[PDB]
């Protein structure tokens, strides 16, 4: 029954994620009717909203817990399988764990060093002959006892489990980004019972919940590296203007209202810098809007050129750069999509001869892509080769399997299709 329950939880991960999102939306919509006198809820001539928030919060916490269980039971095996495959290939080919011995850097390898000693090291890679292969290839160079020591194979209780492999798996799933995001979701949902306003932070799930919103938000993320540098450049420029203003025009920054008020000014550097960052980049017209004009002063022309240069170098150029980064992001994304479409429509993926050679036959290129060189056909062939005992392999199947084990990929056609090699008319 537990296995069936876990399979049911895994099968409906996305549906219950959307359910959690809708529940959070409902909680926020109810949250919108607060009022202070302390923080009592006001209802539109009703009294049935008193437990609706509580039951919705309980439902949200339960659904979020089910979401994290389903994610741990469905998407985690992909991460484990990828990590095991990568470490197995590295150990078999490079042999870095016995030759290179990586340093304190590359923490991933150091953490993966804890899985070699485990008995069930290829738990998901379906290739349990990796230890035998590495022994057969390294025994005559690194001995036999050293490799054996390094590998180290020698409903009531169920205590016969490998705790080292479980610890390594728990370590490697904690560093995953999606699991960390789900843990943050758990923390926010749990904290929502202490304070009802903590459920507002769950609205950020719409950033990744909708595909059409990820394309919008990818424009900012595409050039997000340069946006912070632009902000830093703006901060440096504002600081330089602050230094000039403090050194020369310190007497203008006086905020006196209708005469008879105490003289409030900006004397020290920190106050002037906060004034320039808070006002002047915000006023829409630079710093000259909120300072008195130099009507009849010896520094009038200097103040005028200072204001004009500050405006033209902060409010115009920097903002133009900030919008330009987003515009270039949109253009780059569209150009990449167009290039991908053209590359897929102008040559086939496997050998890439080109459609011009296949246009001699009517609809030749479409037939070639759909029958001769098809990605689905290659994937099905690879799966059928994997899920087949070696005793039943034919000559071609054994040949392909041997090159797949050696990982040479000379059997993939490249620049030579069936029509090019075996012409219909003998020549």
What is the rounded radius of gyration, in angstroms, for the C-alpha atoms of the chain? 33
CB of 361 to Zn ion, least distance (A): 13
Do 355 and 346 touch, CB atoms closer than 8 A? Answer: yes
Do 417 and 353 touch, CB atoms closer than 8 A? Answer: yes
Choose between 83 and 303: whose C-beta lies nearer to a second copy.
Answer: 303
Choose between 54 and 82: whose C-beta lies nearer to other proteins.
Answer: 82
CB of 385 to Zn ion, least distance (A): 21
Partner whose binding site includes residue 131, from Zn ion, other proteins, a second copy, none (CB under 5 to 8 Å by kind): none
Choose between 24 and 172: whose C-beta lies nearer to a second copy.
Answer: 24
Within 191-220, which residues bind a second copy (CB under 8 A)?
197, 200-201, 203, 206, 210, 212-213, 215-217, 219-220
# binding residues, Zn ion (CB under 5 A): 4
Choose between 112 and 307: whose C-beta lies nearer to other proteins.
Answer: 112
Kindly state whether residue 307 participates in binding a second copy, applying the rule CB under 8 A.
yes
Kindly state whether residue 351 participates in binding Zn ion, applying the rule CB under 5 A.
yes
Choose between 337 and 398: whose C-beta lies nearer to a second copy.
Answer: 337
Choose between 48 and 409: whose C-beta lies nearer to Zn ion.
Answer: 409
Kindly state whether residue 326 participates in binding a second copy, applying the rule CB under 8 A.
yes
CB of 415 to a second copy, least distance (A): 5
CB of 406 to a second copy, least distance (A): 17
Do 49 and 30 touch, CB atoms closer than 8 A? Answer: yes
Name the residues that contact other proteins, by CB under 8 A: 7, 11, 74, 77-78, 81-82, 85, 124, 336, 339-340, 343-345, 349, 363, 366, 371-384, 386, 396-397, 399-400, 409-413, 416-418, 421-422, 424
Choose between 108 and 265: whose C-beta lies nearer to other proteins.
Answer: 108
Choose between 42 and 375: whose C-beta lies nearer to other proteins.
Answer: 375
- Look at residues 427, 421, 426 and name the one whose alpha carbon lies nearest to residue 357: 421
Considering only 267, 292, 345, 366, the residue that binds a second copy (CB under 8 A) is 267
CB of 166 to other proteins, least distance (A): 20
Considering only 4, 211, 225, 407, the residue that binds a second copy (CB under 8 A) is 225
CB of 384 to Zn ion, least distance (A): 21
Contacting positions for Zn ion (CB under 5 A): 348, 350-351, 373
């Amino acid at each position: 029954y537990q296995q069936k329950l876990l399979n049911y939880f895994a099968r409906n991960f996305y549906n219950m994620r959307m359910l959690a999102l809708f529940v959070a939306f409902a909680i926020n919509f109810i949250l919108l009717f607060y009022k202070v006198s302390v923080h009592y809820v006001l209802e539109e001539s009703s009294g049935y909203m008193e437990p609706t928030l509580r039951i919705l919060a309980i439902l949200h916490t339960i659904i979020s817990f089910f979401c994290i269980i389903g994610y741990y039971c469905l998407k985690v095996p992909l991460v484990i399988f990828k990590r095991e495959k990568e470490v197995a290939r590295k150990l078999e080919f490079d042999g870095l764990y016995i030759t290179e011995q990586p340093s304190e850097d590359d923490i991933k390898g150091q953490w993966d060093r804890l899985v070699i000693n485990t008995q069930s090291f290829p738990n998901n890679y379906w290739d349990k002959f990796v230890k035998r292969k590495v022994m057969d290839k390294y025994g005559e160079f690194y001995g036999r006892d050293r490799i054996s020591e390094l590998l180290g194979m020698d409903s009531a209780v169920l205590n016969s489990i490998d705790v080292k492999y479980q610890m390594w798996k728990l370590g490697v799933v904690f560093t995953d980004n999606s699991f960390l995001y789900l843990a943050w979701y758990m923390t926010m949902s749990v904290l929502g019972h202490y304070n009802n306003f903590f459920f507002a932070a769950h609205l950020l799930d719409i950033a990744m919940g909708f595909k059409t919103l990820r394309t919008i938000l990818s424009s900012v993320t595409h050039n997000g590296k340069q946006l912070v540098l632009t902000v830093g450049l703006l901060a440096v420029v504002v600081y330089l203007y602050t230094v000039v203003a403090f050194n020369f025009f310190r007497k203008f920054y006086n905020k006196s209202e209708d005469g008879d008020t105490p003289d409030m000014k900006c004397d020290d550097m920190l106050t002037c810098y906060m004034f320039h960052m808070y006002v002047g980049v915000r006023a829409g017209g630079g710093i000259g809007d909120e300072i008195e004009d130099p009507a009849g002063d010896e520094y009038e022309i200097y103040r005028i050129i200072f204001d004009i240069t500050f405006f033209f170098f902060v409010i115009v150029i920097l903002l133009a750069i900030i919008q330009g980064l987003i515009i270039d992001a949109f253009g780059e994304l569209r150009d990449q999509q167009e290039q991908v479409k053209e590359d897929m429509e102008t040559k086939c993926f496997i050998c890439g001869i080109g459609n011009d050679y296949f246009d001699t036959v009517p609809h030749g290129f479409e037939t070639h892509t759909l029958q001769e060189h098809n990605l689905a056909n290659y994937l099905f062939f690879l799966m059928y080769l994997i899920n087949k005992d070696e005793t039943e392999h034919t000559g071609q199947e054994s040949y392909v399997w041997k090159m797949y084990q050696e990982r040479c990929w000379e059997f993939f056609p490249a620049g030579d299709c069936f029509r090019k090699q075996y012409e219909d008319q003998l020549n």
